[PDB]
Write a protein that binds this ligand. Structure first.
Ligand SMILES: *[C@@H]1O[C@H](CO)[C@@H](O[C@@H]2O[C@H](CO)[C@@H](O)[C@H](O)[C@H]2NC(C)=O)[C@H](O)[C@H]1NC(C)=O
Ligand SMILES: *[C@@H]1O[C@H](CO)[C@@H](O[C@@H]2O[C@H](CO)[C@@H](O)[C@H](O)[C@H]2NC(C)=O)[C@H](O)[C@H]1NC(C)=O
Ligand SMILES: *[C@@H]1O[C@H](CO)[C@@H](O[C@@H]2O[C@H](CO)[C@@H](O)[C@H](O)[C@H]2NC(C)=O)[C@H](O)[C@H]1NC(C)=O
Ligand SMILES: *[C@@H]1O[C@H](CO)[C@@H](O[C@@H]2O[C@H](CO)[C@@H](O)[C@H](O)[C@H]2NC(C)=O)[C@H](O)[C@H]1NC(C)=O
Ligand SMILES: *[C@@H]1O[C@H](CO)[C@@H](O)[C@H](O)[C@H]1NC(C)=O
Ligand SMILES: *[C@@H]1O[C@H](CO)[C@@H](O)[C@H](O)[C@H]1NC(C)=O
Ligand SMILES: *[C@@H]1O[C@H](CO)[C@@H](O)[C@H](O)[C@H]1NC(C)=O
Ligand SMILES: *[C@@H]1O[C@H](CO)[C@@H](O)[C@H](O)[C@H]1NC(C)=O
Ligand SMILES: *[C@@H]1O[C@H](CO)[C@@H](O)[C@H](O)[C@H]1NC(C)=O
Ligand SMILES: *[C@@H]1O[C@H](CO)[C@@H](O)[C@H](O)[C@H]1NC(C)=O
Ligand SMILES: *[C@@H]1O[C@H](CO)[C@@H](O)[C@H](O)[C@H]1NC(C)=O
Ligand SMILES: *[C@@H]1O[C@H](CO)[C@@H](O)[C@H](O)[C@H]1NC(C)=O
Lengths: 801, 801
């Protein structure tokens, strides 16, 4: 008995009766807002695909009271990456799912259960996989609970080992070590590899509580038989089953598809249904066509959300009504949704679209039919567009209106010639009436043919640009003339005319010998700016020949400057005599980075250190709201007055020509290094390369270099004394601070500390006044990185004579 | 020798010579980017007002090498709340300022000094005050340093006590305990209370290294003498000194002012200079006038940053040139800067200001003179404003143009009547020429007198509004008529016409018996919306009488709905039988909150707990990227299908009529409580009050309620046994889990555990088979909150007979 494709039980506590016969729940399960007021127990349920959710169920004390035999929660579809959600469950004392074995996908969210115990008593690491992403907060604190399993087994949690159980009467069932990844029966006999959870009988396909791969005819098959297909994620159905499945009712709702041996709702991305609503998907070349079908016969695009419904459509079975009064970046936003619409089965009406200066956002639209036409047989109908300068009718575009006429009225900024060129490609020359296209109220303010403004000279700095164009006499002697400079930051040249354009109005100079120009104030160094000037011809005599002047879009890049310091210098040592160091490109390069120049200087071993007698110390040293961005900016501004011109310890200098990583070679092991890193550019040979962002790093210690390189010698001396002599390590890791002699008669119990200064005087150490007998001794040098290895024992005797 | 008002030594290491004679540095001190290559030592310097900054000084090993006698850094003005910044100082080993005593204001920033030791050896808690906000990161790690003071005193850092010193040769100077807040000489004789730091001689005004209040004539005065004034924050100067001080050169730079006995740069907020540039400030009523003076004779307002310079000005000594092509919210942003400008000494030119539909942002502007006028004697000159519908010339405003004419041209949306009404208040009737104001190219598209659209019916839901207005026959029979509905969320009624307005175009219905209306889709419940309809009259016959239709701004509020759950319920217990609980108003009230309704239910003491024998246990219980907002939203949507209609343990119910806080009375001490909190509204008596956001809280334990209420009695029993009998605590804190008997012959060494179930059987405990002798015994009850007090000893004997 499969139940689905989704159970949502809420409010009525009696509504839980829908689970009387369900053994598997295909899809999620929701038990919400239940107020229990006899009990309900469902031992039939064992498997739940997708997730299980519980929320605000009053009266329920344990989950075992409802689903005691629940074994596998597949989590095929998750509730926000959660396969089990127990949230705000009052009166609930424990997760009584003592038969739960495997949660195949997702995490667990257990939250806000003031009486929920037996949380730490469950080893979730063996029932699910992603234990790290589990969410168990806000439950009953373990300090005030009292978990006590009846009296079973136990295992390791972190470094702790404690008992495991689900409730106060049942323990956590586990499988023996011999089955490995397989499952086991209650009697601990291994279950068939394709099984999952428990077994009605050991090693049998038809005796499984839940299959781990797929299910068909009572058998746990790895893959579906040849004539069956994967449905959901656990069972196999035949072809006649998915020909009867229907998706959620929508405007373009259809049946399910068979693809890649799976029976899914829609064809996946990059696939389209073969034939006419057939059951199979065919690979579609490049972009796959999505025909959009809507209930409303005339789709009205009056906002930005209305256009979102036409996103990615290739053909529109309906009528388009554009009505866009407001909108700033809609010219490029509509092109995201409607830029792929190619065919319109009906008519297109551009009414009251004051925000549209052009129709270029309707790219790829090459076919308009005329299945339904506006009153009077019209397939293209624009009206009252106070800013429509041009159509999408560039001479590159293609268009074909099958049937209908075109009506144009009250579009003042649209040149009347542009709509005569439309019916050329449209193919409706002479099909319209005499009033459909009228020079009155259309093209009244249109400035069609314009002149050309020619730039004359440009001068660049690192932040200023001076540009001058030729004087422009207006077409009529009586026109008042003024200019308007449009300039904006354009990283590359493909620029559309006015938009985040910066505008300034400069007047024609009074003296006729000087030409009009403009000075730009504060610009970023080495930045390409798109500039073009436009004339303002206020004609006292209107129309006759409305004539403006426009210049070409000139791209001017400012000069380069001193670069910024490299960002976040990090360094490590993977080996002695080697230093790796990485960084990030500077904040303001101001040109082409070209290369980096890095310098490393040896640092002296710390002053003093040689001076102190480290046999007296107890610790010997070793070695291996928020406006702070404005604070650090002040110190970056200081680094402009000092640059770096490239060419006691000396600096070594190397150029890194491409990457932001480099490895330094030939270094003294366990020595500190000052790593100066600069950033130059292509103009840094005259501007000077940038300042330095430096870091300090120490290399790895030379292994085995701080131990005694020779044998220990001994010489008897006055009293009952012995003088141990040993060679000094030539190249220690940093510096040898002290030696330790470990000697004794039977056990090397007596220990003698030999300071560095003591060894420099005598070349060894004198063991003072020993008891007679046979002795052994071991010596160990301690450097700055650490100690070396003990020497092999030296043997000396003190005679009692 | 006072040096200032700011020393900035950088780059040139020889430039440090400017401190040869300075004993006090008035203002900050900057030593940056220095590269030392003989040494420089300045024992003269002792005091530094404001802060001291050091950055990237190579070669310097200790700060004592430069300023050994530096005693007081006043920090009058801070470098971002820092009085001392030592950042990226290479080769620096220690802060050698061994004479530093008091840092009066600010924190310390010591960062990125890889060789800086002697940081933990300094007790900064006695030289500065805000030790919490200090920043000491990125220096030499204390593990690899080796701080060793020569060989002085020591004190407590946190819970540690260690030696204090500045460098390897000098220690941290401190003052004896007898001086308290006062200062001390090197020889530990207390310094005059007005002194600070050290003393040339004990207890003398003229023998101070630094005064703590102020300084004058070699004396540390608390306040300045009557004829002197506070300058900076340490010395007193006479009146003739501040009459010679000049601020930083600006467009309106003047001398300093004397105010409140202090000599400051400008008059403080709420004060203006008396007379004509005098030395004293006078209280100005309400808003204080700020006359703005600029070098550029004609200020050009062509952007949003240019207007920021005119912020708060009352009078403008110059000419205003408005040229605003772009800008959305500039109509209300310009009113922030220019809304207080009242008088303009020159002319005003509104050129190419297409973004301006009105000049209302120039509020309070009531006077325009004419000191300089545009060519042709013009004081008001507008030109080419394609959207200027009206001036700021409301009949409420006042204006007076002293001299000059007014020229109007190429303003199409400006009604020609509006500028005739201007020269009424302006007072220039007949002063202009015949071409200065022309009906041509002015008012060409202006729709002056308009009709009135009347609403007919409105219907409201919780998210939808239907509104219908009367049918409108256009003035001309041949006009095409359409409507445009403007509606936007308006919390209150003061609304300006079109702006974040939502617009939709509805057509006049074909049937003449039905009136035009519109249905609004998804609105917030209980929200006031401003709605008004506007007619679109496309006149086939242009002008004659351009006539539009506009409606009144109708304010419609939607219905109320079920409120949201209260936010973040927190609860605590300040006393037994009392529970305080606070919360936050719901996310979506949907009406007037009116009141809250809270419920508290007693929770039963945990099941079991009574069952276990807690004398065997070892621990007895006690008690006292980020889309999770979308996750929690799903659970808030679930709480709409279940509401609360207001009226084993019973629920107690109380109404909170105003605040979001309440205190529950009459409770059982140390008992858990379920606190259900709902949020109602004025319509919740029919809609139903909202769901509950509940919390659990336990009250305080009843003090002394879990101890024995009577004396202990003993009775001899068979063997050598004793049966101790004691009364049970009537009202324990939660529950008595176990008793402990502490008995012995000479010392109460033997301890007997008495479980709760054992006491229920016998009413006491039997001490089993004791050795003969005299005994004492003490008993203690352990409840859920904790243990009670031991009983006074009971005395019993075991005879050996
Ligand atoms: C629950 O069962 C599933 C499926 O039987 C287990 O999923 C395995 O996940 C690992 C992860 O690398 C894959 O390599 C295996 O191939 C998966 N199994 C199969 C049959 O494909 C999952 O590990 C099980 N979880 C627990 C806790 O036992
Ligand atoms: C900005 O770059 C231009 C070149 O793109 C510089 O003009 C050059 O200036 C040098 C002066 O050292 C002359 O020798 C060259 O002949 C100039 N080249 C051209 C094409 O004019 C200009 O000087 C740079 N700006 C600054 C401030 O250095
Ligand atoms: C350094 O000296 C100043 C001024 O002498 C001290 O400032 C005192 O701050 C407390 C804070 O509550 C005030 O109550 C006192 O009135 C201030 N002193 C005076 C004279 O007004 C500051 O505490 C001193 N810092 C150290 C570390 O001694
Ligand atoms: C929204 O509020 C209006 C009143 O402002 C409601 O209109 C009332 O509806 C009740 C129905 O129970 C009638 O008894 C009243 O006479 C109506 N008053 C008016 C002034 O018309 C309207 O029903 C509310 N909307 C909803 C969905 O309940
Ligand atoms: C469940 O099975 C019973 C028989 O035991 C049957 O009467 C009933 O109709 C089935 N379905 C439901 C929803 O109870
Ligand atoms: C211009 O071209 C570049 C690269 O071809 C592209 O990244 C950018 O989006 C284009 N911009 C426009 C406005 O076409
Ligand atoms: C900077 O780099 C770009 C990209 O490779 C290149 O086109 C340009 O010529 C370079 N500029 C110079 C001055 O080499
Ligand atoms: C340091 O001493 C320990 C002590 O036995 C030794 O194991 C270790 O090898 C020594 N270090 C080196 C580098 O030999
Ligand atoms: C500092 O004092 C000396 C006298 O010791 C004098 O010669 C010099 O001019 C003064 N000023 C400076 C800046 O050195
Ligand atoms: C409307 O008035 C309210 C209160 O008087 C005020 O907070 C708000 O800013 C005003 N808005 C406008 C546009 O005047
Ligand atoms: C809601 O509160 C406001 C503010 O006090 C008040 O003006 C309004 O009348 C109230 N509404 C009702 C229905 O009482
Ligand atoms: C709990 O026992 C300690 C042990 O002496 C005692 O000091 C304390 O007062 C006891 N608690 C109470 C509430 O009496």
């Amino acid at each position: 008995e499969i139940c689905g494709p989704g159970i949502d039980i809420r409010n009525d506590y009696q509504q839980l009766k829908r689970l009387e016969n369900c053994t598997v729940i295909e899809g999620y399960l929701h038990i919400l807002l239940i107020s229990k007021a006899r009990s309900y127990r469902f031992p039939k349920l064992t498997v739940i695909t997708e997730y299980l959710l519980l929320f605000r169920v009053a009266g329920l004390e344990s989950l075992g009271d409802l689903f005691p035999n629940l074994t596998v929660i597949r989590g095929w579809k998750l509730f926000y990456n959660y396969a089990l959600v127990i949230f705000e469950m009052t009166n609930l004392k424990d997760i009584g799912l003592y038969n739960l074995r495997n949660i195949t996908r997702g995490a667990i969210r257990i939250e806000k259960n003031a009486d929920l115990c037996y949380l730490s008593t469950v080893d979730w690491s063996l029932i699910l996989d992603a234990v790290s992403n589990n969410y168990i907060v806000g439950n009953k604190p373990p300090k005030e609970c009292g978990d006590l399993c009846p009296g079973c087994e136990k295992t390791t949690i972190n470094n702790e080992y404690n008992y495991r159980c689900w409730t106060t009467n049942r323990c956590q069932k586990m499988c023996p070590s011999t089955c490995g990844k397989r499952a086991c029966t209650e009697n601990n006999e291994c279950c068939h590899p394709e099984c999952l959870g428990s077994c009605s009988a050991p090693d049998n396909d038809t005796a499984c509580v839940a299959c781990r791969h797929y299910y068909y005819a009572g058998v746990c098959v790895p893959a579906c038989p040849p004539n069956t297909y994967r449905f959901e994620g656990w069972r196999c159905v035949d072809r006649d089953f998915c020909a009867n499945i229907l998706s959620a009712e929508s405007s373009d709702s259809e049946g399910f598809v068979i693809h890649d041996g799976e029976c899914m709702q829609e064809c996946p991305s990059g696939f389209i249904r073969n034939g006419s609503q057939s059951m199979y998907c065919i690979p579609c070349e490049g972009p796959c066509p999505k025909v959009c079908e809507e209930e409303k016969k005339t789709k009205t695009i009056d906002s930005v959300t209305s256009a979102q419904m036409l996103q990615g459509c290739t053909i529109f079975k309906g009528n388009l009504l554009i009505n866009i009064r407001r909108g700033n970046n809609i010219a490029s936003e509509l092109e995201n949704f409607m830029g792929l619409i190619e065919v319109v089965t009906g008519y297109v009406k551009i009414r009251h679209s004051h925000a549209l200066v052009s129709l270029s956002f309707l790219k790829n639209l090459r076919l308009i039919l005329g299945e339904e036409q506006l009153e009077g047989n019209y397939s293209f109908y624009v009206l009252d567009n106070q800013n429509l300068q041009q159509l999408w009718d560039w001479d590159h575009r293609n268009l074909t209106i099958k049937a209908g006429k075109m009506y144009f009225a009250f579009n003042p900024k649209l040149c009347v010639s542009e709509i005569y060129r439309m019916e050329e490609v449209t193919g409706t020359k002479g099909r319209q009436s005499k009033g459909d296209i009228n020079t009155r109220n259309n093209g009244e303010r249109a400035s069609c043919e314009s002149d050309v403004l020619h730039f004359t000279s440009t001068t660049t700095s690192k932040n200023r640009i001076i540009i001058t164009w030729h004087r422009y006499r207006p077409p009529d002697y009586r026109d008042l003339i003024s200019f308007t400079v449009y300039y904006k930051e354009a990283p590359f040249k493909n620029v559309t005319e006015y938009n985040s354009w910066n505008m300034v109005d400069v007047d024609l100079p009074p003296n006729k010998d000087v030409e009009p120009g403009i000075l730009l104030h504060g610009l970023k160094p080495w930045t390409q700016y798109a500039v073009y000037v436009k004339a303002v011809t206020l004609t006292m005599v209107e129309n006759d020949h409305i004539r403006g002047a426009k210049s070409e879009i000139l791209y001017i890049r400012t000069n380069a400057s001193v670069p910024s310091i490299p960002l976040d210098v990090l360094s490590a040592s993977n080996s002695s005599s080697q230093l790796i160091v990485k960084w990030n490109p500077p904040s303001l390069p101001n040109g082409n980075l070209s290369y980096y120049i890095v310098r490393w200087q040896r640092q002296p071993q710390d002053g003093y250190l040689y001076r102190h007698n480290y046999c007296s110390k107890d610790k010997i040293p070793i070695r291996k709201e928020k406006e702070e961005a404005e604070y650090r900016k002040v110190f970056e501004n200081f680094l402009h007055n000092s640059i770096f011109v490239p060419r006691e310890y000396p600096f070594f200098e190397s150029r890194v020509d491409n990457k932001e990583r480099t490895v330094i070679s030939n270094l003294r092991p366990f020595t500190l290094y000052r790593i100066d890193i600069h950033s130059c550019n292509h103009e840094a040979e005259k501007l000077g390369c940038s300042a330095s962002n430096f870091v300090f790093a120490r290399t790895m210690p030379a292994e085995g270099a701080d131990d005694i390189p020779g044998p220990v010698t001994w010489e008897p001396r006055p009293e009952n004394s012995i003088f141990l002599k040993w060679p000094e390590p030539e190249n220690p890791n940093g510096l040898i601070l002290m030696y330790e002699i470990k000697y004794g008669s039977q056990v090397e119990d007596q220990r003698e500390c030999v300071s560095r200064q003591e060894y420099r005087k005598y070349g060894g150490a004198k063991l003072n006044r020993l008891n007679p007998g046979n002795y052994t001794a071991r010596i160990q040098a301690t450097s700055l990185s650490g100690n070396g290895s003990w020497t092999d024992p030296v043997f000396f005797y003190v005679q009692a004579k």
